[PDB]
């Protein structure tokens, strides 16, 4: 099938088909004279049964769109033989967003890094649409192209404006196009069920198309799931897409014709940080609104999302809770605003937060901007510690087990099973990777904290021994005088009351045992603060996984084998028939898939999970040991200001003859 | 059985003739599967010239290899017969990742292999070679296209020896007579008897492998062969011989740079080599003794094994010289004490252990002279131990090799374009390597200067914490103790004690005043606005947010993919018409991307690095000068506290 088509300047092979639709096909072509490739869109023979009024609808829409996040329409030429108008537009090799969301890596949500890029580009393009006055009512992951930027960072772009119209900000259409799962309810009603009633829509459908897309890219799952799959139960799908209560972003049905579980929260399987979910779920619950009353406008949406995109991330790790946190804060905020963000995520008050960073405390003045903070990463975060007790939470993942392998040799039934069984092991690999970082950040901060209790202990000795000398020679300043108070004169047989300077001697000397008992009390502190003490991190290098164990690398090696089988089974499920030997290998490798998934899921729960929980217990007992010692060291620290302010007023009386 | 042209089989295995892994004069190797299981194996069938080397003496070699089981030997499972031809076939373990040669043909490794992988190669090659010597099998044929690579259970690669094509059973010392191998990795004795059809009574030992091991290691370490006669070594059959024979003692590489001209003999690694300076000083002597042509000064295996075992048994502590802007890997033994650690820092940075100050994770590092290196702080390369002296040091920076792009030849040549895309992509690979190193060095300087400045604040606070203790004694234990009871004799009593000590009290008290004058100046110089500021550090140089290395990697991937296509375009000697023009267009695209990357590398990464290097160098002066000045005040404090420590010893007399 080496047939081809060409225009005046481009040519393409019919076999080199990129995408496909009901209205046109998309090919990988080249410029005849430059060699550079473009995506060529030729319209099939059935698109010329549409009116000439409607076959220009996509042509005038793609004309008034020139922007990144919009697939660049390079030119528009006529094919040689058929004289059909075709669209020469830029070619994105990396596929669509749907191409990405099908990777088993992102089966439970995109990495939080990429999600912010999808957030950035979708809004930027969708804004450029309403800004130029076009409502593209077919926004779906298969529609959002991905191209690699000059800096390696992804850049997403919109296309496939076959479902478009010249929409004004208060105009509404009565026509029908789109794809099921990512379409507004009052367009799903008329398009799927051919049932129309009492509403027309314009510029509000896309907010729903965007919101459903964002939930998919965040959780790896569609937000509104009827049981038996979403292929049928359209009556149930509409029961969920419209009967959903305002403020709940997901509607899933567990049973067959059973309940409709509503939820306003992200699932535990989500990959995004908790600091982001609290910012994100409001946006989803307000563009996932059927009616125009309780819904958000484009004005409010673009303002709220830009607030998220215009923030910066400061990584903060709670040492008493063993929980990482991402602080989404503007660069113009203050330090006292920062403390508020940390309270909402850790439930520890602003007045209780000490900031350890790179083996040092952190001078935290409220009049300092966020951009002048020390640069933070997830591996080099700002630690936070509190002198009041906190529950050691730890990582809270979702316990996911493997699905049940089916013995029926089914080409697409094994491909669908290979996707999920690899995704489950993929999630466990991501969790074991986080469990490693949580343990390694524990070791990093505890060592920095121990070095700070030594700075707290060494600081008092420099002050206590500084008042032990202020009292050493202040007590002999009136002892060399009371020595001669009766050396030249009356016999000093015993100690009696002599004058105003006799009580400033018998009570001031009491600060030699009341303070002498502190010098011996600090020794018990320095003992437990020493290598052999009851506060050593000897267990920290003894419990839990280590990076030198390479547990994550071992899991990744099993996962590669599982992934190679899955990518093979999708080649197999294309053309649903296999030769004899090929069928047997498929059956053999199907069993190896279960072997690798079992070995992986075993090593996760037995080596990574078991030792992490063992590490979380040997650290729960050390939190109390340390927080109790800080309570004692500070009580001794405050005594050296009650002993030294007392030897201050009596220091004036002792400077005399 | 098969249809004669597409597949062969044994009783237990079968394979397609298209799934061919390797060819050879005696046999070919295919990718096959166990019949009853489906699991994969490499199948080696001996068609022709299997009868050239005797069958019984070669069959007994197979049975003893069937019992061989080691990590670094390709397992020989069973030995069977092909169904219809009845040729002997060996079933072996399949290594999907290919050979070490495939790894060295990547552009990423066009120069040094990454140090991590090189240690793996050194470990496995030595491990497998020792297993053969301990079982009495001579390889005499080892080359990169011969060392297989598999991915272990932990993702780290595991190399496995195979194709003992020159092999028989050997003792520790006897006589031989054979000829097998490939030209480049060959001992000079065999290079005459296998390339230039000329024989002599020259003898061997355990050393003929040691030369091939030496040439193979140098290749993996530098990306090039150690002996190159002007043109390709495969063309100058005579000049290549003249080099290895007259190889001077100590030299490990000879390259003829001018045609029929002199041969530049080098005794150390090229600058382009990726390996650390710490490892080079250990690897170079090993390569020297094994690349010895004559058996009189060669090493022998017992010494070669224990020597490389020492390199492998060492761990690495990462150390960054803050004043020199140089990173260092320290190959120390786990049982080695802390004292020898300082020795290794000396040999690399010229900093004696008396002025070796160590910072790690925000604080100084105290070094107990007997602490074991297996309990040092764990060090990554981005989390090293910083070393500073109070003594001046030349700020060196990173020493890389200025490698410009080759001249892209304009002629349409399927072979030339493929061989040119290899080199030019490798140059952008080396440039991207350095671009990442430069950014690390700059980010480590920022992490070090930030810590050191905070350390000087600790040294400052320690001395001002001491000044408040001698003044609370000088002004109180002397000015008050003496003025009350001692300067009131009006008659031991009134001697040089009242005259000299009262003056020295006021000598020290008045001079101590201007010590506070110089102390607040130092506090001002390391305060926010002072001459010692982190300001220029956050302003000069490239940054992670710049994403230079990512930008360079994007260009490199387009070049890499064009090269991999030109590789397949070379598989055909002739290209179809439209394919020829794509290859002609992508050739210009390949050179466009390269010059674009080299521009951004030199104008962005290099310049701002060198600009950062200067503002670094000028800050070292102002830093080292401030520490010398604060120290002089610190010793004045102890001096004043010492002078007063005995004047107070006579104020406690109190007999007047």
């Amino acid at each position: 099938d080496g047939i081809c088509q060409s225009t005046s300047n481009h040519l393409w092979l019919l076999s080199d088909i990129l995408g496909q639709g009901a209205t046109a096909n998309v090919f990988r072509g080249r410029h005849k004279k430059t060699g550079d490739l473009f995506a060529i869109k030729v319209f099939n023979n059935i698109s010329f049964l549409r009116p000439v009024d409607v076959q220009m609808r996509e042509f005038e829409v793609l004309k008034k769109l020139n922007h990144k996040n919009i697939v660049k329409l390079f030119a528009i030429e006529e094919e040689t033989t058929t004289r059909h108008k075709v669209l020469i537009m830029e070619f994105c090799p990396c596929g669509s967003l749907y191409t990405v969301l099908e990777e088993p890596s992102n089966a439970y949500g995109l990495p939080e890094s990429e999600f912010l890029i999808v957030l950035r580009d979708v809004v930027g393009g969708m804004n450029h649409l309403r800004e130029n006055g076009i409502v593209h009512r077919n926004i779906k992951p298969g529609n959002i192209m991905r191209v690699i930027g000059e800096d390696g960072q992804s850049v997403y772009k919109l296309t496939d404006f076959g479902a478009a119209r010249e929409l004004e900000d208060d105009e509404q259409f009565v026509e029908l196009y789109g794809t099921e799962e990512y379409l507004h309810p009052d367009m799903y009603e008329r398009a799927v069920l051919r049932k129309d009633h009492q509403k027309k829509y314009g510029a509000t459908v896309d907010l729903w198309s965007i919101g459903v897309t964002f939930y998919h890219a965040a959780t790896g799952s569609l937000p509104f799931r009827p049981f038996e799959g979403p292929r049928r139960n359209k009556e149930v799908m509409y029961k969920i897409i419209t009967g959903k209560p305002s403020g709940a972003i997901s509607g899933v049905q567990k049973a067959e014709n059973g309940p409709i579980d509503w939820s306003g929260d992200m699932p535990v399987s989500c990959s995004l940080s908790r600091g982001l979910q609290v910012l994100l779920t409001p946006v989803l619950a307000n563009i996932l609104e059927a009616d125009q009353e309780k819904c958000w406008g484009f004005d409010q949406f673009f303002a709220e999302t830009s607030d998220i995109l215009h923030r910066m991330v400061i990584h903060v790790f709670s040492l008493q809770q063993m929980t990482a946190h991402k602080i989404y804060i503007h660069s113009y905020n203050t330090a006292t605003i920062f403390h508020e963000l940390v309270y909402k995520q850790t439930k520890i008050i602003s007045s209780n937060q000490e900031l350890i960073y790179e083996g040092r405390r952190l001078v935290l003045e409220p009049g300092r901007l966020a951009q002048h903070f020390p640069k933070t990463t997830e591996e080099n975060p700002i630690f936070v510690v509190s002198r009041e007790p906190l529950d050691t939470i730890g990582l809270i993942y979702e316990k996911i087990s493997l699905p049940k392998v089916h013995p029926r040799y089914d080409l697409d039934g094994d491909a669908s099973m290979a996707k999920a069984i690899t995704g489950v092991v993929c999630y466990a690999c991501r969790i074991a990777s986080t469990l490693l970082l949580y343990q390694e950040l524990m070791r990093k901060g505890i060592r920095w904290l121990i070095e700070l209790i030594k700075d707290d202990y060494n600081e008092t000795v420099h002050k206590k021994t500084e008042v032990v000398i202020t009292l050493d020679f202040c007590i002999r300043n009136i002892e060399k005088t009371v020595k001669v108070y009766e050396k030249l004169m009356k016999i000093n047989l015993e100690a009696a009351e002599l004058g105003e300077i006799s009580d400033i001697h018998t009570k001031l000397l009491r600060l030699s045992s009341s303070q002498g008992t502190i010098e011996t009390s600090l020794q018990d502190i320095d003992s437990r603060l020493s290598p052999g003490g009851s506060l050593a991190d000897a267990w920290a290098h003894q419990e839990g996984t280590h990076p030198k164990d390479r547990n994550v690398e071992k899991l990744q090696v099993l996962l590669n084998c599982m992934t190679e089988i899955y990518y093979q089974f999708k080649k197999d499920q294309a053309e649903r028939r296999l030769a004899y030997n090929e069928e047997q290998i498929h059956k053999f490798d199907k069993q190896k898939l279960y072997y690798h998934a079992t070995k992986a899921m075993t090593h996760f729960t037995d080596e990574c999970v078991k030792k992490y929980e063992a590490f979380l217990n040997k650290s729960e007992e050390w939190i109390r040991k340390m927080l109790h010692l800080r309570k004692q060291l500070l009580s001794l620290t405050n005594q050296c200001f009650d002993i030294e302010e007392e030897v201050s007023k009596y220091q004036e009386y002792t400077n005399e003859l | 059985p098969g249809l004669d042209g597409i597949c062969q089989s044994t009783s237990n295995h079968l394979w397609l003739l298209s799934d061919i892994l390797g060819q050879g004069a005696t046999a070919n190797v295919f990718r096959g599967r166990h019949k009853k299981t489906g699991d994969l194996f490499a199948i080696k069938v001996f068609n022709n010239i299997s009868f050239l080397r005797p069958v019984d003496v070669q069959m007994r070699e197979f049975e003893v290899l069937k019992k061989l089981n080691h990590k670094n030997i390709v397992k020989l499972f069973a030995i069977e017969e092909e169904t219809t031809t009845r040729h002997k076939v060996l079933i072996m373990e399949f290594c999907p990742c290919g050979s070490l040669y495939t790894v060295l043909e990547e552009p990423s490794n066009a120069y040094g292999l990454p140090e991590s992988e090189f240690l793996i190669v050194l470990r496995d090659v030595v491990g497998g070679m020792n297993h053969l010597r301990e079982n009495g099998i001579v390889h005499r044929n080892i080359k990169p296209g011969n060392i297989m690579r598999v991915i272990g259970e932990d993702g780290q690669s595991v190399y496995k020896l195979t194709d003992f094509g020159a092999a028989r059973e050997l003792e520790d010392d006897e006589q031989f007579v054979e000829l097998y191998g490939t030209e480049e990795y060959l001992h000079p004795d065999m290079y005459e008897r296998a390339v230039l059809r000329k024989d002599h009574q020259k003898k061997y030992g355990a050393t003929v492998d040691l030369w091939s091991i030496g040439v193979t290691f140098y290749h993996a370490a530098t990306g090039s062969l150690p002996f190159r006669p002007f043109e390709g070594p495969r063309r100058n059959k005579e000049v290549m011989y003249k080099i290895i024979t007259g190889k001077p003692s100590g030299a490990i590489s000879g390259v003829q740079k001018a045609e029929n001209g002199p041969i530049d003999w080098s005794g150390d690694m090229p600058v382009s080599c990726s390996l650390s300076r710490g490892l080079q000083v250990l690897l170079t002597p090993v390569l020297a003794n094994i690349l010895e042509a004559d058996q009189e000064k060669c090493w022998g295996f017992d010494q070669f094994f224990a020597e490389t075992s020492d390199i492998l048994h060492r761990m690495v502590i990462h150390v960054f010289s803050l004043q020199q802007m140089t990173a260092h890997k320290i190959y120390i033994h786990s049982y080695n004490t802390a004292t020898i650690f300082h020795e290794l820092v000396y040999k690399q940075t010229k900093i004696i252990s008396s002025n070796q100050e160590l910072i790690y994770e925000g604080r100084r590092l105290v070094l107990e002279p007997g602490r074991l290196a297996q309990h040092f702080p764990k060090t990554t390369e981005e989390n090293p131990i910083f070393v500073v002296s109070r003594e001046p040091l030349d700020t060196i920076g990173l020493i890389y090799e200025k490698i410009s792009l080759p001249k892209v030849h304009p002629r349409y040549d399927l072979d030339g374009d493929a061989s040119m895309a290899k080199a030019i992509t490798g140059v952008v690979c080396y440039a991207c390597r350095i671009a990442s190193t430069l950014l690390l060095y700059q980010e480590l300087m920022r992490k070090g200067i930030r810590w050191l400045i905070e350390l000087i604040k600790d040294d400052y606070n320690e001395t001002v914490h001491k000044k408040t203790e001698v003044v609370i004694t000088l002004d109180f234990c002397i000015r008050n103790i003496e003025k009350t009871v001692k300067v009131y004799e009006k008659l031991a009593a009134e001697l040089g004690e009242i005259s000299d000590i009262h003056t020295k009290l006021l000598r020290l008290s008045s001079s101590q005043g201007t010590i506070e004058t110089s102390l607040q100046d130092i506090d001002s110089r390391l305060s926010p606005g002072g001459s010692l500021a982190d300001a220029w550090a956050h302003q000069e140089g490239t940054h992670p947010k710049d994403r230079n290395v990512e930008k360079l990697q994007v260009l490199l991937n387009c070049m890499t993919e064009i090269y991999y296509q030109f590789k397949k375009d070379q598989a055909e000697r002739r290209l179809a018409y439209n394919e020829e023009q794509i290859h002609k267009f992508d050739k210009q695209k390949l050179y466009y991307h390269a010059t674009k990357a080299m521009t951004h590398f030199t104008d962005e990464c290099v310049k701002k690095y060198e600009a950062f290097l200067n503002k670094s160098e000028e800050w070292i002066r102002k830093m080292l000068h401030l520490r010398k000045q604060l120290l002089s005040l610190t010793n004045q404090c102890f001096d004043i506290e010492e002078e007063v420590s005995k004047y107070q010893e006579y104020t406690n007399e109190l007999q007047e």
Partner: peptide, 11 residues
């Protein structure tokens, strides 16, 4: 230099 342009009938 010397690159030729693509053609349709050759595909």
């Amino acid at each position: 230099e010397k690159p030729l342009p693509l053609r349709e009938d050759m595909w």
